[PDB]
Amino acid sequence: DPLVTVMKVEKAPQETYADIGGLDNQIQEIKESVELPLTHPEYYEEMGIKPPKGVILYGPPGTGKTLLAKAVANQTSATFLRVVGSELIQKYLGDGPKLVRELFRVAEEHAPSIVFIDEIDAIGTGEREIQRTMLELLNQLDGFDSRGDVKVIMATNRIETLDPALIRPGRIDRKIEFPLPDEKTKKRIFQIHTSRMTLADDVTLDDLIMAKDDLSGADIKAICTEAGLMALRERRMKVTNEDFKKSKENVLYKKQE
Amino acid sequence: RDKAPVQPQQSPAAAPGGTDEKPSGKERRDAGDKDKEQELSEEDKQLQDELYRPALEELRRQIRSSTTSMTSVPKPLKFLRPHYNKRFAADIISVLAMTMSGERECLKYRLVGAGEVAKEWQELDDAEKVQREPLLTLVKEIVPLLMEIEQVDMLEKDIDENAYAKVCLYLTSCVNYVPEPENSALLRCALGVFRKFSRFPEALRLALMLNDMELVEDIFTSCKDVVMLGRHGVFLELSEDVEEYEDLTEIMSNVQLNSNFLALARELDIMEPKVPDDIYKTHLENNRFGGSGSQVDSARMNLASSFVNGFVNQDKLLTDDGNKWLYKNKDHGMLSAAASLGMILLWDVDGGLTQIDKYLYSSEDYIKSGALLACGIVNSGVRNECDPALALLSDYVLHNSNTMRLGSIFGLGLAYNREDVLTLLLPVMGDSKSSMEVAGVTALACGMIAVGSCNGDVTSTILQTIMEKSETELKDTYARWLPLGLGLNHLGKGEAIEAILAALEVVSEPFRSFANTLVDVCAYAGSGNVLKVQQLLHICSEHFDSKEKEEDKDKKEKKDKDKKEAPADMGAHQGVAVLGIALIAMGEEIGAEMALRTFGHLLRYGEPTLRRAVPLALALISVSHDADPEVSYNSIFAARLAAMLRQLAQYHAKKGTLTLCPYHSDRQLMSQVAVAGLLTVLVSFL
């Protein structure tokens, strides 16, 4: 099945928890939440609690940038399990929770891992079967017969799409909120996306953090890629201001289209 | 520009036209020319032409080096004798003289075996010392001793770039791509320039490779003259082999100037820093002595709890959990648990006497024989524990001194060219007892005594064990563990002809031919000899299903440095012996994810020998993801060897011969449990 291969990644990205700033407490809450089991166990197994459920977060920007920038902290030296989009259930006939059983047996054979469910839009997007396979997803996800095996970290986009019944069994450890990226979080995202690259002196920041309006990091990474290649057309690595505004027009048009 | 004014100037063969046309080519020769020197069809008449003939030879080698040639470029320069940060000198010297003198030294290095090439090589040496482009003119002038005067002519102030870069990549490509004698030139000349320079520890690695008595003397009077201490004593004793620490203690006992190198020459000052610093800053959990010491049963998992019990040498509770634990244990477990007291008492030399004396002179011969084994393991420089066992030695069939001979002769072999241990070992090997481990710990004892000697010896020691090896053709395990000590004596050199002497007087029925291929295993510690790699692939398909396991098991020793070539398609074969070859050939390295990836498939197998052999390398290569394989074995098993061996993998989880001999002797575990009595006394662990 080719759909199983595109589920999770087996590489080790160099992006650590020290490459992003501003949300140090928000990243040390999940780092302290899921990095205590199976790693540094003197504060986990001596207490005698073992809540093998993990936190559930949600990113208003989404699109893998914020949620993969928070989940990437566990990807440094560990095995990872990725699940993106609820299309895999709706792109085929109602086979049922057998795919969840496959992820549960590969997670059983891969216990030192992190379960990451992304783009949770099952009920938001037959329709009567989605609710019962989602409630069955909550049933098998609760771990009624298994001991502490893996830490499940769910990640959705809108907190109102999930039914109130999917909260108490799933979210039992802790949940937090993510601030709005208007000027300073987009300034930090711009700094991280423009830390390795070289920019000119005349490149101002107020117009770049002003022309944007509710934008994630995938489009600014896309204009950093096409800006590095477009500026690379002249065999130069320096990104001028007029070329970065010419690439900024893709941002101004993309969100308005 | 256009060649209209200057094109009809090289056609006249007159002397003035050359003596004024050629200086214009030297002026306009800053970037060579405006094109690719298409004027060859017009200067080929000047080829035969000649007052300023050195300029004609210079321009001729300039154009021949400019377009193409193989041998005719350096001839105008070896006949020219050049005497007549810009771009000209950089172009005509740097690259044109780089490839020029490179192909001249290559053609003169391969064709013939005067001093013109020495003058060219020193001229380019100084000119490229001015150019200051390292490792490239160097990496080209490697193959042309002259390298000694080249390094001492160049190593004056640039130490970080030439030592770090040149010694790093030239040492790696000098053990990979350069043969032995030029590596010996690296050792001697590196002893020169590194003796005159700083960074003593790399010269100490040059003592790990040279094994010479003068380097440690000059580095001890120089390290003593230049003023921590216990650290370089620790890795000083770790870096030194068996030869130069007894030679070091005899020369420091001959000088006795400070007696601090005598104090650092033994095992006391390498363990007195470690034990308190390890007990203070680290605190091991007791859930593995209590847990792994609690789920034991079947009289074998309890032995795994005796080994895990031996892991402590912080917490000494499971060690001192009353008595009768050894009395309830069987013989196979009386010897292992008897050596557990030796494993748990690596320090506290003074306490070892009052801890082991309680089991000495007992009624059971195995309790006091394993107690003498403990006394031999706990000490390596005290030499005050041999007398009660070395004294009697007079049974000739069996009285407490064949098992006590295992304990004190094996533990004394671990404690150690001592002549008055072999004068007493002569009746030991000459006894020819039916017990295998007598000649086992004897050949391993004298073998580990003779490791790293002066290119070994073919004396009556290995001659005696070869004659008594071919004395009787019974119990071929003798033929399986006598080549262990034989190879321990042959170890330390590859170019020696002792392997061919064994190919002369040893070649016989495939028993001693397997002995000969074991000598071939331990006689090839590693160099650039890819002939044995293609010969390895040629003899890789031999019908004998053991010389594949050992002769192919040598892979982890031969290419132990270049770990990129070690992974191969051995796992894709169908012979289980080859799966053992790769499974043992993984090694005890840092344990990258590729290794554990190979253990994800090598682990799942149905044979108890391979399923028993996989946790040894799986858990030796990883000493995060430590508990997943143990849960995997809990899911596979839930025989006795799999459970005892997975608990011993819980033991394992949480360039010297001492880290190479024990497991190479452990490569014969597919037999009776008597070998598992020698499994509990390994010294290769860290």
| Separation of alpha carbons B616 and B668, rounded Å | 13
Q: A111 and chain B: CB distance < 8 Å anywhere?
A: yes
C-alpha span between A76 and A69 (Å, rounded):
12
At residue B509, the 3 state secondary structure works out as coil
Count other Cβ atoms within 10 Å, centred on residue B211: 20
* Residue of chain A nearest B632, judged by CA positions: A109
> A151 — alpha (psi -120 to 50), left (phi > 0) or beta?
beta
Computed from CA positions of residues B272, B273, B274, B275, in that sequence, does the dihedral angle turn out positive or negative?
A: positive
- Maximum CA pair distance of chain B? 112
Picking from A42, A77, A112, the nearest residue to B628 by CB comes out as A112
d(CA A71, CA A80): 9
Asked if B392 has any chain A CB less than 8 Å from its own CB, the reply is no
Q: How many CB atoms lie within 10 A of CB A174?
A: 14
Q: Please state, in angstroms and rounded to a whole number, the distance separating the CA atoms of residues B508 and B299.
A: 43
Whole-angstrom CA distances from B346 to A149, B83, B313, B351, B407 are: 38, 71, 6, 10, 16
Q: Number of A:B CB contacts under 8 A?
A: 15
Cβ–Cβ contacts within 10 Å for residue B260, how many? 14
Bridge partners, A198 (sequence order): A238
Nearest CB to B624; choose among A12, A110, A112: A112
Beta carbons of B39 and B60 less than 8 angstroms apart? no
Is residue B359 a contact partner of residue B373, using CB atoms and an 8 Å limit? no
Give me A199's structure tokens: 């920019």
B230-239 vs B200-210: helix crossing angle, rounded to 10: 20
> Could you say which of A12, A42, A78 has the minimum Cβ distance to residue B624?
A78
Q: Contact at 8 Å (CB) between B642 and B611?
A: yes
A chain contacts of residue B631, beta-carbon cutoff 8 Å: 111
d(CA B84, CA B3): 26
Binding site residue list of A for ATP:
59-66
Those of residues 136-165 in A touching chain B at CB distance below 8 A are: none
φ/ψ of A198, rounded to 5, equals: -115, 125
- Between the alpha carbon of residue B445 and those of residues B166, B380, B407, B542, B600, the distances in Å are 41, 13, 11, 32, 37
What sign does the CA torsion over A58, A59, A62, A64 have? Answer: negative
Q: Residues B217, B220, B225, B230: what is their CA dihedral angle, to the nearest 10 degrees? A: -170
User: Token digits for B668?
Assistant: 């014969």
Nearest to residue B123, comparing CAs of B85, B160, B89? B89
What residue of B is the nearest CA neighbor of A111? B628
Greatest extent of chain A over all pairs of C-alpha atoms, in Å: 62
The tokens for B198 are 């700083």
CA dist B615 and B603 (Å) reads: 8
Using CA atoms, how far apart are residues A219 and A248, in angstroms rounded to an integer? 10
Residue A62, Ramachandran bin (φ over 0: left; ψ between -120 and 50: alpha; else beta): left
Q: What is the resolution of this structure in A?
A: 7.3
DSSP symbol at B326: T
Q: Please answer whether residues A116 and A71 qualify as being in contact, where contact means their C-beta atoms are separated by less than 8 angstroms.
A: yes
Task: Check the CA dihedral B172-B175-B179-B184 and report its sign.
Answer: positive
- Say how many C-beta atoms besides its own lie within 10 A of residue B316's C-beta: 13
N- to C-terminal Cα separation, chain B: 73
Tell me whether A78 touches chain B (CB under 8 Å). yes
Q: Kindly state the tokens that stand for B107.
A: 């053609």
Chain B CB contacts of A112 under 8 Å are 624-625, 627-628
Q: How far is B443 from chain A (nearest CA, A)?
A: 45
Angle at B627 between CA B623 and CA B628, to 5 degrees: 115
Å from A39 to nearest chain B CA? 6
Q: Which of B60, B47, B54, B48 is nearest to B79 (CA)?
A: B54
Cβ <8 Å between A111 and B631: yes
Q: Are A220 and A190 in contact (CB under 8 A)?
A: yes
Distance of residue B680 Cα from the nearest chain A Cα, in angstroms: 30
Q: How far is A151 from chain B (nearest CA, A)?
A: 14
State the sign of the Cα–Cα–Cα–Cα dihedral B243, B244, B248, B249. Answer: negative
| CA–CA gap between residue B621 and residue B603 (Å, rounded) | 14
Q: Is B418 helix (H, G, I), strand (E, B) or coil?
A: coil
State the burial class of residue B115 (Cβ atoms within 10 Å of its Cβ: 0-12, 13-18, 19+).
exposed
Given an 8 Å threshold on Cβ–Cβ distance, is B624 in contact with A111? no
Name the phi and psi angles at A117, rounded to 5. Answer: -100, 120
Using the structure block, give the residue that is written with the tokens 């070859």: B581
Alpha helical stretches, state H, B167-241: 167-176, 180-195, 200-210, 213-225, 230-239
B624/A38 touch (CB, cutoff 8 Å), yes or no: yes
Q: What chain A residue is nearest to B636 in terms of C-alpha separation? A: A109
Contacts (Cβ under 8 Å, ≥6 apart) of A44: A36, A37, A50
Q: Chain A contacts of B285, Cβ < 8 Å?
A: 42
Scan for tokens 């014969």, then name that residue: B668
Strand partners, A199: A239
Interatomic CA distance for residues B275 and B348, integer angstroms: 10
Residue in this structure with the two tokens 């033994």, named with its chain if needed: B266
CB B580 within 8 A of CB B549: yes
Q: After which residues is chain A broken (C to N over 2.5 A)?
A: 125
Give me the DSSP letters along B71-101.
Answer: SSSSHHHHTT------HHHIIIIIIHHHHHH
Backbone φ and ψ of A85, nearest 5°: 80, 140
Exposure on the CB side of residue A44, measured as CA atoms within 13 A: 14
Q: Which of B669, B665, B678 is nearest to B641 (CA)?
A: B669
Which residues have C-beta within 8 Å of that of residue A25, sequence separation ≥ 6? none
Total residue count of chain A as it appears in this document: 257
Among candidate residues B305, B297, B302, B237, the one with its CA nearest the CA of residue B265: B237
Please state, in angstroms and rounded to a whole number, the distance separating the CA atoms of residues B371 and B360. 6
Instruction: From residue B421, give the alpha-carbon distance in Å to each of A172, B413, B438, B447, B468.
Output: 70, 10, 15, 12, 19
CA B578/CA B560 separation, integer angstroms: 19
The residues pairing with A117 across neighbouring beta strands, listed in sequence order, are: A83, A154
Which chain A residues have a beta carbon less than 8 Å from that of B284? none
Instruction: Please name every residue paired with A84 in a beta bridge, in sequence order, or none if there are none.
Output: A118
Does A51 touch chain B if contact means CB atoms closer than 8 Å? no
Q: Say how many C-beta atoms besides its own lie within 10 A of residue B52's C-beta.
A: 16
Distance CA A101, CA B394 (A): 70
CA distance A38 to chain B (A): 6
Contact B643, B612 (CB under 8 A): no
Secondary structure, 3-state, chain A:
CHHHHCCCCCCCCCCCCCCCCCCHHHHHHHHHHHCCCCCCHHHCCCCCCCCCCCCEEECCCCCCHHHHHHHHHHHCCCCCEEEECCHHHHCCCCCCCHHHHHHHHHHHCCCCCEEEEECCCCCCCCHHHHHHHHHHHHHHHCCCCCCCCCEEEEEECCCCCCCHHHCCCCCCCCCCCCCCCCCHHHHHHHHHHCCCCEECCCCCCCCHHHHCCCCCHHHHHHHHHHHHHHHHCCCCCEECHHHHHHHHHHHHHHCCC
Kindly identify which residue of chain B lies nearest to residue A35, measuring between CA atoms: B624
Q: For B229, how many CA atoms within 13 A lie in the half-sphere containing its CB?
A: 12
Chain A residues whose CB is inside 8 A of the B627 CB are 38, 112
Q: Provide, as residue numbers in chain B, all residues whose Cβ is less than 8 Å from the Cβ of A111.
A: 628, 631
- Element of type H or E holding B594: helix B593-602
Long-range contacts at A8-15 (CB < 8 A, ≥ 24 apart): A8/A80, A8/A81, A8/A82, A8/A83, A9/A80, A9/A82, A10/A80, A12/A75, A12/A76, A12/A77, A12/B593, A13/A72, A13/A75, A15/A69, A15/A72, A15/A75
Do B506 and B518 form a contact (C-beta atoms < 8 A)? no
Joined tokens for residue B185: 């030139």
